[PDB]
Amino acid sequence: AFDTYIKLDKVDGESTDDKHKKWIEVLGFAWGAGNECTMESGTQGLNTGKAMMSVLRVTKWMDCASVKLASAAVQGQNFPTLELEICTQAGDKFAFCIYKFTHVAVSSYQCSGATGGSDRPQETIDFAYKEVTWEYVPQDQNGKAGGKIGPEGWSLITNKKK
Amino acid sequence: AFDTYIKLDKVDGESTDDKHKKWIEVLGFAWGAGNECTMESGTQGLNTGKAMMSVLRVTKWMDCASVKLASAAVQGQNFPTLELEICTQAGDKFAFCIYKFTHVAVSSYQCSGATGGSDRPQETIDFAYKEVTWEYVPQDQNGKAGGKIGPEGWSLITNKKK
Amino acid sequence: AFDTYIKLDKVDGESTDDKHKKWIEVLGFAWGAGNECTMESGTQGLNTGKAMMSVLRVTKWMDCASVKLASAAVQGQNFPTLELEICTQAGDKFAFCIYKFTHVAVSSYQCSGATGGSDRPQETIDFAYKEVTWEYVPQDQNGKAGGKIGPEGWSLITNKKK
Amino acid sequence: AFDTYIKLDKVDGESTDDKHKKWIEVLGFAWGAGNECTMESGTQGLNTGKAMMSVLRVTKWMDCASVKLASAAVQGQNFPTLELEICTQAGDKFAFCIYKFTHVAVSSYQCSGATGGSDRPQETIDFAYKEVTWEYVPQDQNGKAGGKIGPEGWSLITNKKK
Amino acid sequence: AFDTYIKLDKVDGESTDDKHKKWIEVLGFAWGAGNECTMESGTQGLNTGKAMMSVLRVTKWMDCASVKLASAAVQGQNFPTLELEICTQAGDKFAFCIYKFTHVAVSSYQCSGATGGSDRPQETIDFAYKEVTWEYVPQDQNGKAGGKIGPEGWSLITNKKK
Amino acid sequence: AFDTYIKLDKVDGESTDDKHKKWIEVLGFAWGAGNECTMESGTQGLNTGKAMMSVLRVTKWMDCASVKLASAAVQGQNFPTLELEICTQAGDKFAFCIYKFTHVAVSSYQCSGATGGSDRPQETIDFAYKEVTWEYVPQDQNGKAGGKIGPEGWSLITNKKK
């Protein structure tokens, strides 16, 4: 259920499934946005102010991407595009949620090792970006998919939509 | 027990039950209000000062509303009306508590994915607003409902009741 | 054991037991007082300074009082009298502790809903006040009650006892 | 094991055991002292500076002392003497630790009620003081007691020993 | 699984396995790097700013290295090289991750003892450094290893790569 | 396993084992040292700066030493020597780690009592000092001991080694 993959330009991960070959296998993502809307209690309009977005926080094991992720950090390396993709365990293994970032960087890379229990050390990566898109897809109780829900998004270079 | 649904103007969720078609299915809500009454210990009257209210914090899975919720955030999108509704599992599936917000915005949208366990990622949404109403309904031990308890509320535009 | 009820002037709760009809059924109360006695280590006398008291923090389910409690908050509504009462499960269901507040307000009302597990949402209410009284009653191991322990208390309008 | 009792001048608690009639039965005490000795790393001598002591934090159920404890708080009531006593479950139910405070006050009284589970609400009391004494007594593996370990202590009025 | 060893110049640990004789056996490592990339939302470029790296936090039992580690701390002792190495439990016990630090110091040494349960006290060591290298190696599902992933790294003396 | 004893000059504890008669039996110790080595990222050398050490935090039950420990606190009492010693459960009950402090004080004494469960109240003592030594001893898998690992240490009066 909710198997998550993520793609970086010229950065081979280790995945194996048909639709995500050499992608990076990821556990959790965590991501957020929201504006500066106060509870005011004195102003007539709402007053949304400015828009804002959060880094994406990826969790995953060590793989073949580690070293590049490690270097990316201290290198301030610019990527054109990061694609996040969560795909259904059942149904048709399709992506019911397709995220898309543009102008991405690794803002932090962390590493740590349980020691003697769970296999594979675990890393946590923070991906800073400029632009992004949501895209969601429902699933027919009959197993199959349904219509895709209008790909929308936002840009921190323009402070406009999509 | 305590099944919670929530409605937004022109924002189809995914619900299915008769009374809440295409509504957004929600787990928890959390909401609060209260004034600035100090323990003083020097003033003769009570001294309630100003009134205040909190954002509503919704919890729910990803659905078809996600993308719109996502966009709403960075878009500062204004909605006329948000209706919250908690409905009894037994009895007559009626709403024993009907909340009503007027002039609503999404102040924050957060996203996160367990990775490989529970199904469906989970989002947490903060809804800023201008006005609102409580409304509660008791339930007859004989299963059925009882009289509705006077719909009351408050406005941050007037700082008056109802 | 330790069943707690609480009464507000013209504010029907939902209780049912003989001695507390239409009272508000409550789970926890939490309450505190104490003065500003420092560990000094330089002054000869003790130096109690000023007296102080805390809000009472009530916990309970949603009931018929909710809406009034909700309104009370933003309304800064003044009540003459709040009576707290904890009554023995065994023995004679009598109140072994009788609290009494005078000039009460709701300083905050909070709401929240588990989602799908425990029944009934849960609210937490903070009651600000001016005056109050303890009153305790022992219980005879023979089941029955014993003498009542001198009703005492204090006032924040006078900073005197009882 | 480690049954704790505590005595206040003209303040009947509820205890029953032979050696502690009408004393107040207590669960935990928590107490501390220590000076202002820094890790310096620049000064030749140690440099203990000033001496200091902590309030005693008592935990216990509601009893017949509650009301007096409650009043003591807001009243800044001065007591001459508080005796703490921890007594062995086995052996001879003797006190292997005898604490003694002089010039005591209640600096805070807190109250709280679980609601519906454990019996008896629980209060936490902070006792401010001027002077105090330790006294400890070993126990013969043969069940019986041993010699008492020199009653020592300290005073915050003199900043001298015993 | 994920057995971790670490080597210091002229500092015999206690390990025993063929490939890591007299090395120091370690449980967890924890390590991190990342730059100062803000979510900006006003600047056109990304703006990675400066690069930065974290201390390495080692966890291990007391061994023969303890005393030297202890002395290193207060001595500010400079080492040329610290090699970290995590080796597969299965396959060929090879190191699928080879870390390499240059110009290392012990910035802190901590000690602590459970008391009576787990064997061996536990120490936590922080290793400050100047330079370092990642190096990772995949593993053939057929048990054996695969190609090594380009040894990269970074230097805080140059603020350049590798 | 890892049985810990500690000795103070003219301060009889309660221990019983042959090698530690009347010593104080202790559960945990916790102790630390380390210098002020920054991650700099601008300076060429390492830059260890100053050396520093932590108090030793002892945990133990109440015994015959309590009262003296209690008095030591408020008395700022100077001891010449504190010896810490952790001894193997198996093998030959020898001390595989011998700590030695010189010019010791009790900087804090804390007390607390579970109430009715675990036997014996528990105290936590902080020992401030001037000087100290590590000393470790390996153990032959054949049960017996091995060579002792050079007794080293440090002084806060000189800021030199051993």
Residue numbers in the entry:
A (entry chain A), B (entry chain A), C (entry chain A), D (entry chain A), E (entry chain A), F (entry chain A): 2 to 163
Quote the original article:
These two molecules are part of two hexameric rings which can be generated using crystallographic symmetry. Each monomer of EvpC consists mainly of a β-barrel domain, with extended loops lying predominantly on one side of the β-barrel. The diameter of the monomeric β-barrel is approximately 12 Å consisting of 11 anti-parallel β-strands. In addition, an α-helix (Ala66 - Gln76) is located on one side of the β-barrel. Residues Gly35 to Met53 form an extended loop which protrudes approximately 20 Å from the β-barrel. A head-to-head stacked hexameric ring structure of EvpC can be observed in the crystal lattice. This stacked ring structure forms a tube with an outer diameter of 80 Å and an inner diameter of 40 Å. The analysis of crystal structure confirms that all these residues (D4, E15, E26, K161, K162 and K163) are exposed on the outer rim of the EvpC hexameric ring which makes them available for interaction with other proteins.
The type VI secretion system (T6SS) is a recently discovered protein transport complex which contributes to bacterial pathogenesis. Our previous functional studies showed that the major secreted protein EvpC is a key member in the EVP system of E. tarda and the secretion of EvpC is a critical step for the function of T6SS. The overall structural and sequence similarity between EvpC and Hcp1 strongly suggest that EvpC is a member of the Hcp family of proteins.
